[model samples]
Target: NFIWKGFINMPSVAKFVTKAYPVSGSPEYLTEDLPDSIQVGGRISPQTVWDYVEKIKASGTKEICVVRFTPVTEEDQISYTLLFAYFSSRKRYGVAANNMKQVKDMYLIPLGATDKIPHPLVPFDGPGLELHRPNLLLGLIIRQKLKRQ
Candidate 1:
């Protein structure tokens, strides 16, 4: 069994955003309506976002979809950077949203570590096979922010 512990150095931007967006209600909270400019993080160029999205789609996972949005403000863009960085840090090195195959494997009940495992920060329960991918936390953050507005 692997044991790990470390403080989540939440960026100031995330803190501010977490306060700004509280999840629930409205079109913005829906995954499809997520603002493109602030969705994955402001720094990730739109082209790069589509490339990653394409790679995941190519891997045979149809659960993913792209959403468009009107232009965003500079402040919201800053928050996106923090959320994106946090999401990127959650996955182990070499594992990313673009690699759905590896992501699929993470959902399986591990040989001995199943019951002992703590549930992830975000709700990951789903039908049949469901994996707790950390980027969903970022989605939750976005949803939360929407509610706060």
Candidate 2:
């Protein structure tokens, strides 16, 4: 009777487990919410942004990639979407890379050419951009620390 009861609830238990613990390293698990202080197209410095990246790296991020896209339009508008993807586990690199590639190919490339548009993967250690946004940079750091735990 005990075995029969356990078997009867197996499907429900499986559902709960699946919902509770998503596939590790999958986009769903990797996704995180952005802080209020960081805003799209908001102003920030390359040096200041890297400071945040380094903070995350020091906390144990394995590798970090920062991607920025600025459109070539004349509407006084700039697409300053900052993409910061960090991978703490080696196994998660493929997942992170795939997401980054999709963003670069689909969104970044269409905006402008290599010369007009700066490279997507900017080196964090270099002299920071004169101006940038904190959303993507901060989001990456927050997500990395959350998932690493």
Candidate 3:
């Protein structure tokens, strides 16, 4: 027999976000909104959470959708977030809402990952199939901030 080491237990939700991908960025900050900002979060990593939110936004921009993310100690030894209700779009928010049903992937098993957005966070090749693409000179982005809890 062997004595078991007391390894820390994992959280309720295991991380779906796996792997790392790098890219690039810039910034623009503004204020005010109709308050479509929603929320999202997850296990393992941020990018996976991001991928989910990006899909919900349906290739939407910060101008069209607002996302609020936060992390809490819900499980395991490791870590997580994605929730986008809407941003500042006069019309885009409606479109984002149309695709908001996409979040159901987390709930239903019948539906697999479906495409609703213009630009997908995961590439057609996935670089590894579902992970975000790195170093896209073509274009890349995620935006939000200036809030305090």
lDDT of each: 0.27, 0.24, 0.24
TM-score for each predicted model, relative to the true structure: 0.23, 0.26, 0.17
What lDDT does candidate 3 reach at residue 84?
Answer: 18
Extract clashing residue pairs from model 1. Answer: 21-144, 21-145, 22-144, 22-145, 22-148, 23-143, 23-144
**Model 3 stretches astray by more than 4 angstroms:** 1-25, 29-50, 56-141, 144-149
- Flag regions of model 1 displaced more than 4 Å: 1-10, 14-42, 65-149
RMSD values for the candidates in order, in angstroms, are 18.1, 18.8, 15.6
Number of the top TM-score candidate:
2
RMSD of 1: 18.1
The residue-by-residue lDDT of candidate 2 on 1-149, one tens digit each, is 00000000111111100011111122332223211112122224334444554564576744342323222232212222212221111111111122331222111111212222233234444223344333221122124323333
TM-score of the candidate numbered 2?
0.26
Candidate 1's residue-wise lDDT over 27-139, tens digit each? Answer: 23233332212212123332334455445445653233111111135564455445445444543111112222112211101111122222332222322112432222222
Q: Who wins the lDDT comparison?
A: 1
The TM-score obtained by model 1 is 0.23
Evaluate model 2: give its lDDT: 0.24
Clashing pairs in 2: 46-128
